[PDB]
Design a binder for this molecule. Structure first.
Ligand SMILES: CCCCCCCCO[C@@H]1O[C@H](CO)[C@@H](O)[C@H](O)[C@H]1O
Ligand SMILES: CCCCCCCCO[C@@H]1O[C@H](CO)[C@@H](O)[C@H](O)[C@H]1O
Length: 22
């Protein structure tokens, strides 16, 4: 479950960064 949570947060953070860059 911690793998799931950490990975969701990591992917969402990546999406936020990408949207900012775009
Ligand atoms: C999965 C979640 C990733 C954990 C990231 C660690 C949190 O990050 C930490 O949060 C603290 C909260 O006060 C801040 O004080 C630290 O400066 C910040 O680096
Ligand atoms: C699934 C594809 C997502 C692509 C994410 C692109 C992240 C970088 O994107 C590019 O970044 C440049 C500066 O960093 C900007 O000047 C460009 O306009 C932006 O397109």
């Amino acid at each position: 479950p911690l793998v799931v949570a950490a990975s969701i947060i990591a992917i969402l953070h990546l999406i936020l960064w990408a949207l900012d860059r775009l």
